[PDB]
Amino acid sequence: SVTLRLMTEHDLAMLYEWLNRSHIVEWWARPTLADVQEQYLPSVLAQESVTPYIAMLNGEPIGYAQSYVALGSGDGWWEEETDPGVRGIDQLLANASQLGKGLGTKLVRALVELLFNDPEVTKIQTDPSPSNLRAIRCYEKAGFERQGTVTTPDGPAVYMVQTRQAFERTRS
Numbered sequence: 001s002v003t004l005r006l007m008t009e010h011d012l013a014m015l016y017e018w019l020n021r022s023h024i025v026e027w028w029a030r031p032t033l034a035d036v037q038e039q040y041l042p043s044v045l046a047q048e049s050v051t052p053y054i055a056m057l058n059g060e061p062i063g064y065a066q067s068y069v070a071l072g073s074g075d076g077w078w079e080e081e082t083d084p085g086v087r088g089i090d091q092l093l094a095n096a097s098q099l100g101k102g103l104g105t106k107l108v109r110a111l112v113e114l115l116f117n118d119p120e121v122t123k124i125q126t127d128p129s130p131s132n133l134r135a136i137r138c139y140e141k142a143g144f145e146r147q148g149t150v151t152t153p154d155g156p157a158v159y160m161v162q163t164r165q166a167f168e169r170t171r172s
């Protein structure tokens with residue numbers, strides 16, 4: 001069972017290592033330690049309405065995740081959003097030897113549950129790139145539905161949603 005804790009300043013050097021592992025680099029640019037400290041400091045992320053978490057498994061950190069207020073995004077992101085209740089997610093697994101063993105699906109399921117525990121939250125979104133079939137499949141298994149293609153400042157994305165109603169019906 002995978003759980004989530006908030007990321008702290010103390011996790012930044014570990015995150016920096018992960019973001020230079022080649023299984024991560026291919027989908028996530030190759031940040032220096034200072035890049036990571038400037039960009040992923042929780043109080044800096046806070047300014048773009050981003051919350052970082054660390055995924056835990058048997059007491060060990062196994063990945064990184066982010067939630068964000070879509071409406072709170074700016075610089076070209078989700079310009080058409082009108083609903084303050086929408087959240088987006090992103091995530092990664094730290095260890096290549098743990099890829100494709102269902103852990104990503106548990107991580108996403110844990111992150112979806114936490115977010116719907118914000119009573120103001122209406123819907124979760126994700127935006128994997130079209131090439132990223134493994135991320136798209138993992139999200140599907142976690143209850144996300146493919147809507148269609150959207151343009152983002154990083155490029156096209158397969159836009160996927162899970163509503164609160166859908167979550168209510170499947171959680172049992």
Ligand SMILES: CC(C)(COP(=O)(O)OP(=O)(O)OC[C@H]1O[C@@H](n2cnc3c(N)ncnc32)[C@H](O)[C@@H]1OP(=O)(O)O)[C@@H](O)C(=O)NCCC(=O)NCCS
Pocket residue numbers: 023024027028090091092093094098099100101102103104105106127128129132133134135137138141
């Ligand atoms: C995305 C990520 C979190 C998913 O976690 P994961 O543990 O690998 O995914 P899961 O094991 O839970 O399931 C993934 C599914 O993708 C499928 N799959 C793997 N590679 C695939 C491919 N190239 N094409 C189609 N399906 C693929 C698997 O079959 C599996 O589903 P299954 O149970 O039906 O067999 C993880 O792979 C990761 O950190 N990747 C690197 C960075 C990244 O892509 N982050 C996401 C950015 S949107």
Ligand SMILES: NC[C@H]1O[C@H](O[C@H]2[C@H](O)[C@@H](O[C@H]3O[C@H](CO)[C@@H](O)[C@H](N)[C@H]3O)[C@H](N)C[C@@H]2N)[C@H](N)[C@@H](O)[C@@H]1O
Pocket residue numbers: 027028048050068072073074075077088089090091127128
């Ligand atoms: N899925 C994996 C992807 O995760 C991140 O992409 C995220 C952005 O982080 C997030 O943007 C937020 O953080 C930015 C700072 O980076 C701010 O500009 C922005 N205002 C703020 O809303 C978008 N809303 C959603 C997008 N999927 C990585 N960057 C990218 O490399 C990787 O492929």
